[PDB]
Design an enzyme around this catalytic site. Sequence first.
Site, short mmCIF file in Angstrom:
data_model
loop_
_atom_site.label_atom_id
_atom_site.label_comp_id
_atom_site.label_asym_id
_atom_site.label_seq_id
_atom_site.Cartn_x
_atom_site.Cartn_y
_atom_site.Cartn_z
N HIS A 1 0.81 -1.21 0.00
CA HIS A 1 0.00 0.00 0.00
C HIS A 1 0.85 1.27 0.00
CE1 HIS A 1 -2.90 -3.05 1.25
NE2 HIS A 1 -2.11 -3.31 2.27
N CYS B 1 -6.37 -1.99 13.23
CA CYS B 1 -7.76 -2.06 12.78
C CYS B 1 -8.70 -1.43 13.80
CB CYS B 1 -8.15 -3.51 12.51
SG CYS B 1 -7.28 -4.28 11.11
N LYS C 1 4.41 -6.58 15.37
CA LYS C 1 3.63 -6.48 14.14
C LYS C 1 2.25 -7.09 14.35
CE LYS C 1 1.98 -6.76 9.92
NZ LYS C 1 0.81 -7.54 9.45
N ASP D 1 0.01 -4.10 14.73
CA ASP D 1 -0.59 -3.74 13.45
C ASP D 1 -1.97 -4.37 13.28
OD1 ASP D 1 -1.33 -4.27 10.61
OD2 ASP D 1 0.56 -3.29 10.12
N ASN D 2 -2.03 -5.70 13.33
CA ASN D 2 -3.25 -6.39 12.93
C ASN D 2 -4.41 -6.07 13.86
OD1 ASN D 2 -1.00 -7.48 11.65
ND2 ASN D 2 -1.93 -9.51 11.44
N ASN E 1 4.99 -10.83 9.71
CA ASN E 1 3.70 -10.72 10.39
C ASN E 1 3.78 -11.17 11.84
OD1 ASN E 1 0.62 -10.27 9.98
ND2 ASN E 1 0.73 -12.31 10.90
N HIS F 1 -7.62 -9.23 3.66
CA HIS F 1 -6.72 -8.78 2.60
C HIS F 1 -7.40 -8.78 1.23
CE1 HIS F 1 -2.79 -7.83 0.87
NE2 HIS F 1 -3.08 -8.69 -0.08
N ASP G 1 3.44 -7.62 0.38
CA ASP G 1 2.30 -7.55 1.30
C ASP G 1 1.12 -8.23 0.61
OD1 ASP G 1 0.08 -6.91 2.90
OD2 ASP G 1 0.83 -4.92 3.39
N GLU H 1 4.65 -9.24 4.62
CA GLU H 1 4.10 -8.34 5.62
C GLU H 1 2.93 -8.96 6.39
OE1 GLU H 1 5.07 -5.44 6.66
OE2 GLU H 1 3.33 -4.51 7.63
N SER I 1 1.78 -0.59 -5.32
CA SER I 1 0.84 -0.88 -4.24
C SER I 1 0.29 -2.29 -4.40
CB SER I 1 -0.30 0.13 -4.23
OG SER I 1 -1.16 -0.10 -3.12
N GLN J 1 10.31 -4.72 9.06
CA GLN J 1 10.62 -4.91 7.65
C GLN J 1 12.07 -4.57 7.36
OE1 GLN J 1 9.41 -6.20 5.06
NE2 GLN J 1 7.18 -6.40 5.27
N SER K 1 -5.73 1.44 -2.07
CA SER K 1 -5.02 1.76 -0.84
C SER K 1 -3.99 2.87 -0.98
CB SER K 1 -4.34 0.51 -0.29
OG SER K 1 -3.41 -0.03 -1.21
N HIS L 1 -3.74 2.14 8.78
CA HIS L 1 -3.23 2.30 10.13
C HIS L 1 -2.48 3.62 10.28
CE1 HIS L 1 -4.58 -1.66 10.33
NE2 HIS L 1 -3.46 -2.33 10.53
N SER M 1 5.60 -2.27 12.54
CA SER M 1 5.65 -3.21 11.43
C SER M 1 6.82 -2.92 10.51
CB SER M 1 4.35 -3.18 10.65
OG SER M 1 3.25 -3.36 11.51
N1 LIG Z 1 -6.62 -4.34 6.63
C1 LIG Z 1 -5.61 -4.42 7.49
O1 LIG Z 1 -5.09 -3.42 8.00
C2 LIG Z 1 -5.08 -5.78 7.82
C3 LIG Z 1 -4.06 -5.95 8.76
C4 LIG Z 1 -3.58 -7.21 9.04
C5 LIG Z 1 -4.11 -8.30 8.39
N2 LIG Z 1 -5.10 -8.12 7.50
C6 LIG Z 1 -5.69 -9.29 6.81
O2 LIG Z 1 -6.82 -9.70 7.53
C7 LIG Z 1 -6.94 -11.15 7.48
C8 LIG Z 1 -6.98 -11.71 8.88
O3 LIG Z 1 -5.70 -11.51 9.52
P1 LIG Z 1 -5.42 -12.00 11.01
O4 LIG Z 1 -4.02 -11.67 11.37
O5 LIG Z 1 -6.52 -11.53 11.87
O6 LIG Z 1 -5.54 -13.59 10.86
P2 LIG Z 1 -6.02 -14.63 11.96
O7 LIG Z 1 -5.70 -16.05 11.51
O8 LIG Z 1 -5.34 -14.35 13.25
O9 LIG Z 1 -7.64 -14.42 12.03
C9 LIG Z 1 -8.59 -14.99 11.09
C10 LIG Z 1 -9.69 -15.61 11.91
O10 LIG Z 1 -10.84 -15.87 11.09
C11 LIG Z 1 -11.47 -17.03 11.58
N3 LIG Z 1 -12.35 -17.57 10.55
C12 LIG Z 1 -11.99 -18.27 9.43
N4 LIG Z 1 -12.99 -18.64 8.68
C13 LIG Z 1 -14.10 -18.14 9.35
C14 LIG Z 1 -15.48 -18.19 9.07
N5 LIG Z 1 -16.00 -18.78 7.99
N6 LIG Z 1 -16.32 -17.59 9.95
C15 LIG Z 1 -15.81 -16.99 11.02
N7 LIG Z 1 -14.53 -16.88 11.39
C16 LIG Z 1 -13.72 -17.48 10.50
C17 LIG Z 1 -10.32 -17.94 11.98
O11 LIG Z 1 -10.76 -18.91 12.93
C18 LIG Z 1 -9.32 -16.94 12.58
O12 LIG Z 1 -9.45 -16.82 14.00
C19 LIG Z 1 -5.78 -11.63 6.61
O13 LIG Z 1 -6.23 -11.76 5.27
C20 LIG Z 1 -4.76 -10.50 6.75
O14 LIG Z 1 -3.87 -10.43 5.64
C21 LIG Z 1 -5.59 -6.90 7.20
K LIG Z 2 -2.57 6.40 7.96
#
Ligand SMILES: NC(=O)c1ccc[n+]([C@@H]2O[C@H](COP(=O)([O-])OP(=O)(O)OC[C@H]3O[C@@H](n4cnc5c(N)ncnc54)[C@H](O)[C@@H]3O)[C@@H](O)[C@H]2O)c1
Ligand SMILES: [K+]
Lengths: 461, 462, 462, 461
Positions: free
Chosen positions: C54, C196, C187, C191-192, C182, C316, C132, C157, C77, C387, C82, C375, C383
Amino acid sequence: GFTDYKVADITLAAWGRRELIIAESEMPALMGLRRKYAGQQPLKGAKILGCIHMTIQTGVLIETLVALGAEVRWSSCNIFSTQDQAAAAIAAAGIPVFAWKGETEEEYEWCIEQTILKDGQPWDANMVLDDGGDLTEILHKKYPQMLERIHGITEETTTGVHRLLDMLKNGTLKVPAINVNDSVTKSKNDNKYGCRHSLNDAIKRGTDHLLSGKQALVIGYGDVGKGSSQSLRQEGMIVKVAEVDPICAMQACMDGFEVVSPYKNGINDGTEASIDAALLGKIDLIVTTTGNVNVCDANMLKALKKRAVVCNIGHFDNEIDTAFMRKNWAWEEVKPQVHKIHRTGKDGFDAHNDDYLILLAEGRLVNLGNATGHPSRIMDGSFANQVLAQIHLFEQKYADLPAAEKAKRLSVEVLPKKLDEEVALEMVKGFGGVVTQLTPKQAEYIGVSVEGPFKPDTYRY
Amino acid sequence: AGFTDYKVADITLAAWGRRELIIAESEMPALMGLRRKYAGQQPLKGAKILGCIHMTIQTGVLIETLVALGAEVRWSSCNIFSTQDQAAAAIAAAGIPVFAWKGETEEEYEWCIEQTILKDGQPWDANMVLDDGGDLTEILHKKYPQMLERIHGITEETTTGVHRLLDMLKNGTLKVPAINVNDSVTKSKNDNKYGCRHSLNDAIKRGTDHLLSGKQALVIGYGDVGKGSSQSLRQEGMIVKVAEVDPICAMQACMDGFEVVSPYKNGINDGTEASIDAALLGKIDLIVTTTGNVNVCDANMLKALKKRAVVCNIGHFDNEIDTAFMRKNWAWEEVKPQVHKIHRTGKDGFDAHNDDYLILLAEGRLVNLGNATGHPSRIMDGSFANQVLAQIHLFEQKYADLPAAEKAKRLSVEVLPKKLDEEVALEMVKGFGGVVTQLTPKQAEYIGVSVEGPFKPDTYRY
Amino acid sequence: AGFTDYKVADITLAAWGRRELIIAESEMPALMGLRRKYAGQQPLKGAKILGCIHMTIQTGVLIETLVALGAEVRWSSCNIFSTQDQAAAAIAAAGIPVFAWKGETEEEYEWCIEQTILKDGQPWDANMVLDDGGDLTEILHKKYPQMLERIHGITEETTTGVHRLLDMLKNGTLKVPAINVNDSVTKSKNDNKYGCRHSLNDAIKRGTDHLLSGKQALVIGYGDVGKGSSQSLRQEGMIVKVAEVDPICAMQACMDGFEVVSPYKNGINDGTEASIDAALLGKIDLIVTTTGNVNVCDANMLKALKKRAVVCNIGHFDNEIDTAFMRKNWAWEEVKPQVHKIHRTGKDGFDAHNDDYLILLAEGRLVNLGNATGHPSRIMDGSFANQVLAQIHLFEQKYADLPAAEKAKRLSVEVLPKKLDEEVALEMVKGFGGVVTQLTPKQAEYIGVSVEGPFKPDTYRY
Amino acid sequence: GFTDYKVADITLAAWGRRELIIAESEMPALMGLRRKYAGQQPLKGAKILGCIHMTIQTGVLIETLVALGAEVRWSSCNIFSTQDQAAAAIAAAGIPVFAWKGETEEEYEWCIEQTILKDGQPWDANMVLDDGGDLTEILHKKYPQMLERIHGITEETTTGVHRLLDMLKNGTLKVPAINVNDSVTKSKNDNKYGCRHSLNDAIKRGTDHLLSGKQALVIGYGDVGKGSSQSLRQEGMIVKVAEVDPICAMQACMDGFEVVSPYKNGINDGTEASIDAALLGKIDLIVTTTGNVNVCDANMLKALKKRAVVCNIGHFDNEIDTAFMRKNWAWEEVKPQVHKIHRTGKDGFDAHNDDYLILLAEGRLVNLGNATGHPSRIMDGSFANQVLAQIHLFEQKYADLPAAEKAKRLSVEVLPKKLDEEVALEMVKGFGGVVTQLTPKQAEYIGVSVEGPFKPDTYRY
Ligand SMILES: NC(=O)c1ccc[n+]([C@@H]2O[C@H](COP(=O)([O-])OP(=O)(O)OC[C@H]3O[C@@H](n4cnc5c(N)ncnc54)[C@H](O)[C@@H]3O)[C@@H](O)[C@H]2O)c1
Ligand SMILES: [K+]
Ligand SMILES: NC(=O)c1ccc[n+]([C@@H]2O[C@H](COP(=O)([O-])OP(=O)(O)OC[C@H]3O[C@@H](n4cnc5c(N)ncnc54)[C@H](O)[C@@H]3O)[C@@H](O)[C@H]2O)c1
Ligand SMILES: NC(=O)c1ccc[n+]([C@@H]2O[C@H](COP(=O)([O-])OP(=O)(O)OC[C@H]3O[C@@H](n4cnc5c(N)ncnc54)[C@H](O)[C@@H]3O)[C@@H](O)[C@H]2O)c1
Ligand SMILES: NC(=O)c1ccc[n+]([C@@H]2O[C@H](COP(=O)([O-])OP(=O)(O)OC[C@H]3O[C@@H](n4cnc5c(N)ncnc54)[C@H](O)[C@@H]3O)[C@@H](O)[C@H]2O)c1
Ligand SMILES: Nc1ncnc2[nH]cnc12
Ligand SMILES: Nc1ncnc2[nH]cnc12
Ligand SMILES: [K+]
Ligand SMILES: [K+]
Ligand SMILES: [K+]
């Protein structure tokens, strides 16, 4: 061929219309007043001077007044609060509106004039809708004769109500007024929960700063200060609160906030030595919520932690001594309504200087200046009160009363609690909430009607 | 020690009660501040105060303040389960007539109020009344109306008691003027709300030791007590639903982040089982009544509640729950004092391993006082500082000695002036270490107040 | 001078982007501390990094940190919505090849990645990869496998990208080693989750300006992203329900005070419309997907949602929501960029006043980055400091220069050592003004750690 | 006439039984295992030495173990944690238990001894269940010949686990062990959420102090420190957090807490000059959560705000330098497990002295000392893991293997994630939660079985 308005860009009207349609679904009390009162047209023949933030939410308020028979001519009460697509949509509907985001003082006090004058002559206005009391002041002092046709004023905010009560006490108020602010569905909804929604919203849009873990100082703990403190504390900030009212300070303590003063022992003698330098040196963000004058003064601004954010959510920009900062420090525009104030001097600045403060909206109302103010579902309560207040005064033609009867009606009163509750029920319905009905036995036990009102006027909620 | 004009559970608890009394004194600066401020003036000299309010450690600090200003008192509790026996023991050991203990029967309760009213078989020479709920106030109007001729005023503490006074005032049956202590901002918006936030989940943990996080709660009422009760449960992680008949209070519950529901379909309580939202009530792990009304948790709701749900009341009287229905139809198994399993399986005994039961706390009485200790000392400091200020004002008024025309003008139900409300708040804030900013003269004129206060109009709701 | 090796929306936004970068530098002390410690040593001198993440203001500080340490980069990106255009403009104006703008088409997204891979029509002599999501990593393995022969490693990432790496590793198709950025605690558990928390409600407010307090939300997933998203909504006063497939994550949602529900009756997703809990979904005002899985907000769920509910995704990839079904069957009305009303009345046209619609944010793409700015800088500081450390370590290892026999023994997916994770955390804490306590020698000996750390075993979960 | 026990009051057994039957309804995972394995009787022939807080929750754990065929002899692992009605019910069931609330240090060692010896001779024990490592240590140092017959140890808490690893590191661990603490349904449930429930509970029962608006300092931000901080913050306290781990300190900042040190610049040089007297002078409550030694030392106790409350929620009392307070200050008992510590001197005190500190549970575990520890529904996770761990280690039969086979299995290990998930599922159903089942395509998409495990072992939740 409608040629009687001035907006930033009329081509934004279609976008404004799309957001107006969405806002109507978010404002059931205001839209419920449309359906309940559409037939009888209680504002038929009403000609309203309106001065309040030209947002999408105000657009729905305007169109509700018009749908009930009223004519209006509108301007904003703040230079930064207008949503340009809202002003465009209103003008495209054939409604006189003079507002855009980023007005100057000359353009501001001129837009209010364009509402007052129609083809160089006084509009035959008979109602006033105001937010802050600025429009009320201009009529009383510059066009005092127009008010002899006006049946009343409906004032939106605390600053305007206080200023009206100055005139009620001093005997210079020329029509009766409705304290729209002190409806519970306004003060305890708009002023508190509205700022809770939009303060951190505006801070995020302006700076994108992380708030969690950082130190904040909120000046004031009234309705706006309570919501402002919550807006920050729910984001994870460490929030400190200042107050001159011990009762409001007691609530801050009980609500879990540390109560501090910018001055040692709370004594503001005007000197730098009075400043708690250790406290101010820890503050990442200061927000003024008082409606008072100079509550974030020059000595406080000198003592603030480097790179702290400064903003005001009270009605007027004089809560912060921005005049001192204009005269002594160099302003660097980051983006519209976001300035870095370099404390190294005024003759230019180093682009990589670390000793600066970030001022939002040049000290004006930060939620409307750096974001969009309160959301529609909250303003639904305030503007439903506004419409009912316009109905109450226009149906009770004070300007047509004889002189002997006028004295009993001349007042700055709220709306009856029944109307406050009726607005509240429509708001509750919007959430899908289900209110319980008292049994006849239960109503007699606590001594109310099953139909309400459910509280004495002394109740504080 | 020669003095026998009392009755407590165990007089040997006085030393323990005295130790906690000294601690509570350090937690009540506004009340202790009034004790030192007016001691050199003895403003309550000659006052003989009948008192009826929960005999806790906090009440003892109020009582000993009243004595410190010169008053004599005879005291009883306003609830059968709310007395702390060590607080009563220390009061009786201090030479103060007190008649209260935890676990009174109904008959002993009525007996305890009278033992304060009567001294050596004859009416005491009372001239002041402190009441919490109006029971003592009503007993005087009904059974001892001649005593009211010599009493100078009543200082009523709580919302239920205040409501009774406004009814008598409208009826013309109120005999002495009263001060609404409840509606001081340092009382209603402190005691009623923040007190219940501290003590509601406190009482539930002591009675059941139940995990509250993740479970479902229904709070009936969203007044001051309903607001604090809902926060007491929400801050523990409960999923809290709110019921209300006032749409304005219901609006606050929505904005505060609660789903607002009604026990009855479409909110219509027509007295039938079919009116019960059986799906909603079947999901509730815990129900708390906070309204100050009758039968807001009724018999059909108890039938429809989830098995093993907890039922309690934090309004003043136990008639918020239809406990009469449960005493008539279901078998009670005492887990421990003030904790009963109510087996919905029948009347004749119970399976020791039965799974279909409910847990009632304090037998429907005030759960925070019944199963815990009520509000902490630092919160009651504001409420009881208002009590002292209210007692001083009415005693220095001498209503019983006024002319008939003066009696009629002052037979009112009033509160305290805002200036005193602010002075109470200021002392509590200092107790937290907070610092209140002083206005500059230019700022005070700008907002139209005095630098000394009051800072808000009387219309202000805070 | 004559720099044309870029493609951005508007180069005249560079001065604006430079002002916000200078601000962001003051908000990222860990990353800037790395820039100041290593600038004189040039540990990335000779590094040629393909970057795909991004193109935000925060990524810009990362890019210029890598460049300050000696690397050359070519950037794009990893999401079509993003990019912050003022950030892309500032980077391009600094003479750094960057190909990114907000609102790319799918065609342009692929083209931007290709422009980083190819310089003047032929493969750039890249030797490092920062990714990423794994899109760039996949294109290299599938379309440019010869370029990977000179690449020393990949630093990935996010969780979805790490999953794709482990699948390649176990299938024997991964050509170069990788560092899982990650799973640093500074991170993942920063971050995660907290990122959010900050940006989810931020994006919803910018897109809709809807009141959130008192409305109903359904969050699919309760991992790190789901935990932070639920809090982002609950702290605004929403009534939040949580769905999960992991019982342990479900247990945390309960203890955290959320009701755990399933979109399907008894949790059985049999593919029929009858399996949908219509009553539950008919009450939901906002649904957020956080899973990284496929079709967790399916077509039957979208048909059952309450009228005017908001639908958005913060995982993602956009296949968490069945947006393809909505493109195929329902009419889309754009309110403004990245905000669409989806009219469930039909495919061909819509009534402008139709009440049966859903509001989709960012067309199902990452909503925090699509409708806001992702973020904040102080969170991304953790994070992106990881990197830089990961790039330095893999570049200094020089995997690509090893014989085939040595490459096989070195081919792995690893995390950074705990000591480095702790040093990143220390700089973040100093940024808030926090003061970490130092153990005494006896205290460190008592718990069996060195005074300087690491303070936890590798098994610790925090 | 079975008398092989020692309790405070056997007449409290009926009360304990009533609360045990209630507690069993709060522990579905533990009861579910009791119903699942009853037929196989996996612990038939197991002889378990049990040392853990004799609470109602422990009673349900003990009764489960005996249902599977095990014999037990039980004791508490803390002098203040026993619920006398729980021990009475166990003794009334014919189970050897030696425990009561308020033991002396000498009585504590006697209760451990009574489980170890039977009729003055070593019991033929072959299993060990421990909480804190006290029983494990006594066996290795005083009864080593008995460990040659023992098959394994199942350890409950972090402190006991740490002691196991040092025995393995030194080659002094004689039997294998299962670390029950690091199951997610124990560590991230018992240690965190349990303290969130029971910390403020114990402070309320001990002092009845208002917490809102007051200043708190939590030492440590591990699992226990995280739950402790929320226990105070949800009550409205202004919470500051101290940590030696910067990663945990980072979490405190992001969670909304100010991170501070009792020492200037965080440097503990042993002198009074290093104490941040200004900070500690404003602290109303200090809680130690570290499992470390002397983290609330004498110099900190000297500088604390007057009338501040001091308590410990770690496993051992040496987190606070209580020995210094016994030597220098006079102790006034308010009530059992509540003492006033008068800093005016050692020999006697003024009953109205204002310079004192309030110590809870004499520095012992405050949640178990002044309250009842964790609630039943939380301990359901911890004790389900204990039963699974006892079954697994007993079926391995370490004591029967030859020396070379012993060496391969002499370790400290955790339960598989699949069992961790199955315990969590039962807890979720206890709340009425409904877990969604993956479709086969979704399971394939993320690379897990429909049955789980759903996360890699590296996952931190
Ligand atoms: N937008 C952002 O800023 C950002 C940041 C970090 C990660 N992400 C993305 O978000 C996603 C999740 O990341 P994470 O670190 O939380 O992973 P994670 O594995 O820790 O969390 C995912 C969760 O979803 C649950 N799950 C799976 N299938 C499901 C379903 N059908 N119904 C309900 N729950 C279900 C799993 O049990 C798990 O606990 C990834 O794709 C990651 O790349 C986005
Ligand atoms: K920002
Ligand atoms: N931006 C918005 O959305 C919005 C909405 C409503 C009102 N307002 C404006 O905000 C202002 C405050 O409104 P309110 O309803 O909260 O009024 P309020 O009277 O209820 O609260 C203001 C508080 O500020 C305190 N105060 C005054 N001077 C102070 C000082 N020097 N230091 C500390 N505390 C001080 C007062 O004691 C009072 O409690 C008004 O000007 C009003 O018009 C803004
Ligand atoms: N236990 C304590 O520590 C304590 C402390 C203070 C007050 N109280 C008592 O608690 C009660 C409530 O006091 P308060 O100050 O909150 O009063 P309040 O008038 O401010 O609030 C009561 C609320 O209940 C609502 N209500 C009435 N009937 C209802 C029904 N059938 N369903 C739903 N809502 C209904 C009313 O609309 C009102 O808002 C009083 O009896 C008071 O004496 C107890
Ligand atoms: N009372 C209970 O209910 C209960 C429950 C579980 C565990 N415990 C006990 O509590 C203790 C802590 O357990 P845990 O699981 O939280 O362990 P943990 O390892 O997760 O947390 C301990 C924390 O203390 C910090 N720390 C160490 N020395 C410090 C110092 N001088 N100053 C500040 N912080 C310092 C460490 O950095 C670490 O983060 C153990 O002894 C455990 O047995 C008690
Ligand atoms: N603990 C307490 N003592 C006295 N009055 C009270 N009212 C509520 N709680 C109380
Ligand atoms: N109730 C309880 N029983 C046993 N051990 C515990 N540890 C914490 N709380 C406990
Ligand atoms: K808005
Ligand atoms: K109390
Ligand atoms: K317990």
